[PDB]
Design a protein around this nucleic acid. Sequence first.
RNA 1: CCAGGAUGCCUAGUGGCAGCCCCACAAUAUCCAGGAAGCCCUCUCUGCGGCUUUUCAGAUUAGGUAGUCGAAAAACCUUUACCUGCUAC
RNA 2: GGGCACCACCAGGAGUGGAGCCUGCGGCUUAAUUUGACUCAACACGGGGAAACUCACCAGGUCCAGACACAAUAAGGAUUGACAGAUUGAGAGCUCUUUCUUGAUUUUGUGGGUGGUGGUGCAUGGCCGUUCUUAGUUGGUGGAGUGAUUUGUCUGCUUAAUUGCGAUAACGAACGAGACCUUAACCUACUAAAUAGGGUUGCUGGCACUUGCCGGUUGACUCUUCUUAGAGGGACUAUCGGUUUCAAGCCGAUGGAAGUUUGAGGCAAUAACAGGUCUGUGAUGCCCUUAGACGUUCUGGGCCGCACGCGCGCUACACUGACGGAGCCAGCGAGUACAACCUUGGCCGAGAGGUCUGGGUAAUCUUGUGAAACUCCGUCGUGCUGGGGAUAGAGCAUUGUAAUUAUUGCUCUUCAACGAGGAAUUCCUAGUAAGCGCAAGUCAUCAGCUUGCGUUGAUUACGUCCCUGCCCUUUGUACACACCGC
Lengths: 223, 69
Amino acid sequence: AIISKKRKLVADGVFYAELNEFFTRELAEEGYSGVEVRVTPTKTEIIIRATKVQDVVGENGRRINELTLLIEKRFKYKRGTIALYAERVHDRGLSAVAQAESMKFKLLNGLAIRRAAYGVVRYVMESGAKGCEVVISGKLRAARAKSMKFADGFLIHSGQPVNDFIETATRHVLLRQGVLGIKVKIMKDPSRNTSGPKALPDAVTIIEPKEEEPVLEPSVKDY
Amino acid sequence: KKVYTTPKKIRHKHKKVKLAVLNYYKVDDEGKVAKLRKECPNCGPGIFLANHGDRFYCGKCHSTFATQK
RNA sequence: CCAGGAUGCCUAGUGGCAGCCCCACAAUAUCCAGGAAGCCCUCUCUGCGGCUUUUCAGAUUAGGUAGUCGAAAAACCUUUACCUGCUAC
RNA sequence: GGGCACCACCAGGAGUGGAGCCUGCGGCUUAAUUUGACUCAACACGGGGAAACUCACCAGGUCCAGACACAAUAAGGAUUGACAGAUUGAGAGCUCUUUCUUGAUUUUGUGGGUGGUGGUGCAUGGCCGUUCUUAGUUGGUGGAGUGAUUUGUCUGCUUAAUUGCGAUAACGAACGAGACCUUAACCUACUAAAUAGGGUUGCUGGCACUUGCCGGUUGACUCUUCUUAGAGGGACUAUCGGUUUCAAGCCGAUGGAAGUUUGAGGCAAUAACAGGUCUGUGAUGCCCUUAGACGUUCUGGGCCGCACGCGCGCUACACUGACGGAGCCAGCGAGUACAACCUUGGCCGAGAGGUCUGGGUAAUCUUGUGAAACUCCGUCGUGCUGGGGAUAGAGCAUUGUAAUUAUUGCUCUUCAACGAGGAAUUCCUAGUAAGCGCAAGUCAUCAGCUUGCGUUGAUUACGUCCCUGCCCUUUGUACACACCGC
Ligand SMILES: [Mg+2]
Ligand SMILES: [Mg+2]
Ligand SMILES: [Mg+2]
Ligand SMILES: [Mg+2]
Ligand SMILES: [Mg+2]
Ligand SMILES: [Mg+2]
Ligand SMILES: [Mg+2]
Ligand SMILES: [Mg+2]
Ligand SMILES: [Mg+2]
Ligand SMILES: [Mg+2]
Ligand SMILES: [Mg+2]
Ligand SMILES: [Mg+2]
Ligand SMILES: [Mg+2]
Ligand SMILES: [Mg+2]
Ligand SMILES: [Mg+2]
Ligand SMILES: [Mg+2]
Ligand SMILES: [Mg+2]
Ligand SMILES: [Mg+2]
Ligand SMILES: [Zn+2]
């Protein structure tokens, strides 16, 4: 403890990244999406967003406990000062990482790839994205590599409306023949974004005017 | 790549020349025992000296004697 | 690579602070247009790249064909050209 | 035919190409001088400034890190260890001399993995570069075609832009551009501060000596202009003039901090390339290899060698200079407690550098980083000169285990080539070009490199298609692996 503030921050960031990586590695079966780290005094809250929350939990404190222990071992903490929580994801289809994971799982299982992609897209649409896109790259039959693009709706490529709006998700998939590279972009609808702006920066919606009756005598109305 | 050189002489780890119920120690009477060579001064009894031409050592302390016996 | 010998107007100059004190501009020809190193070349003091080869291979690459490169004995002073590679809910 | 661009040219600047030297890359050389990549889009690139490590190469040695399955020894030892000198580069038990330890780990096989800076980027992922930061791309109707398709997406004029205006079997749309974001500029208007700066005043130093001038002190009190950085505004080509079917716009004055898309970037479409990377990768297919390894690991080298080619670069050919003094001003940064970071201040040393001491985990201390180029007065005056500093010899320092194949610094000495560089060709349009230094990056030590930063600060356009490239259109096509074609 006690370092340059910036340095400390950097270290923290690194730690977070590591944690995320670990989660990606380990909670594949569980369908992990992302971590949320809140460093208060004494306790530190590690929130986990996964699909199979129950699975993550185990059977009333087991897997989670183990994970916590591992974390402690890694980063020299004591028992009590780390607190893990496994929470549900508010709308899975709006998330990108989760979708990617699902796709990977499907691939592993052995499903028609294009069909799977289509299904995923449909799911995303249902969830309520303005538009989404999936790229599946590699040897989808034959030795020569091909990219396969599957998209619906709008897809903002340029500008700052990308970090704010598009959730991205890359994930390699190892198979007997070789590797398949899955990429997924989900353009969330502006209205359901909350953080940042609630609308695109170029769109200018003009309100409808209100009618009035001219003249009708000079008149008065006193009190 | 470049071809391997081939001088010829290979050296393997020695198999050790294992031997048990070794001819150290003895008994004459039956009741009592008669120790051969000597035990270690540094460590406790049970370990036995290595005997050479005015040169000794022991294995539990890898090899650490000097004085004769 | 070379240099001026003299028939000559040269001309004791004109400009810019001429003043001697520097700058720049003004003196046809030249007769020779001539000399030194190098000079088409052929044998020597007898050179290192040919001659075949047989051994292989480096490879040349997506695959392959034909040539080429590298280490071992005998007279003579290119790694490129060209063929053949893939489809619906 | 029509566009566009200082990666095109004009009008100019600075140049490079010559010189020496650095450094890349060839070629040769070499045990080995590891490899990747060659038009732009290879060549100061691999963040690649290699002393070992790195490291892949060579000469040599060491080690198992041979997971797991199944049998041969199964303690009358499986195999583990092992001081002493010869051994060994060698206080490598590397072993052959040895005769002590070690206890079922192993180990001897057979299935089976594992590792590999081994291979193949023309087997792949991801990322990146390039077509292209150019202006391009798409689909829904509707029309033209039996059809592939086409129109929309275009004569013209505009614009940096398929940017718009217009003309129109097309109408309204999306992507790309724009908007967006970040930063660079303005705020005597807000919110703020002894970690930012000032004002009055206390004590206090010196002056002229009247009241006044410069100071030094975190002594008090108060302020926010500069500071920062929060919230906002502010520029929209604004007002006016022309010009243009009185459109899109463009051109000039006025005001305004700002009138080049306000400047600069960040991102940046469709389709791709057999472009690069399997030497960032526990990203990886397959092949190879796989216990005297192409695994690892030690030790010594090597990437740095030199008849010689090109490529970034630096230093100079001086008088707009050189050398001395003196004046003396920036902005980006960065910086340690489990390490050894930046390191003021004091003493020693001609220096380099040593030492003691601090201050700093940082608007606080280094640091006003009083950086250079600059400015002033003097010394040499246009001579391969005091220009120029190379190669050289020696010593003094430092970093590290190790400095010879000078690591770097400093001290003296040596004084080479080069009097502005041919054919060629690069970069550039404003706080730019060029100069100048700083800065972090790599870093134990090394800057001629790099990403940034500020300082000094111009010349000439503000156009055009002459070249070069690229884009479209119309044309022609025996091409479609598409001119490296057939
Ligand atoms: Mg857009
Ligand atoms: Mg943009
Ligand atoms: Mg070897
Ligand atoms: Mg280009
Ligand atoms: Mg080098
Ligand atoms: Mg460069
Ligand atoms: Mg070095
Ligand atoms: Mg490896
Ligand atoms: Mg590998
Ligand atoms: Mg490739
Ligand atoms: Mg290739
Ligand atoms: Mg149609
Ligand atoms: Mg069309
Ligand atoms: Mg007007
Ligand atoms: Mg801009
Ligand atoms: Mg400061
Ligand atoms: Mg001299
Ligand atoms: Mg460098
Ligand atoms: Zn002992």
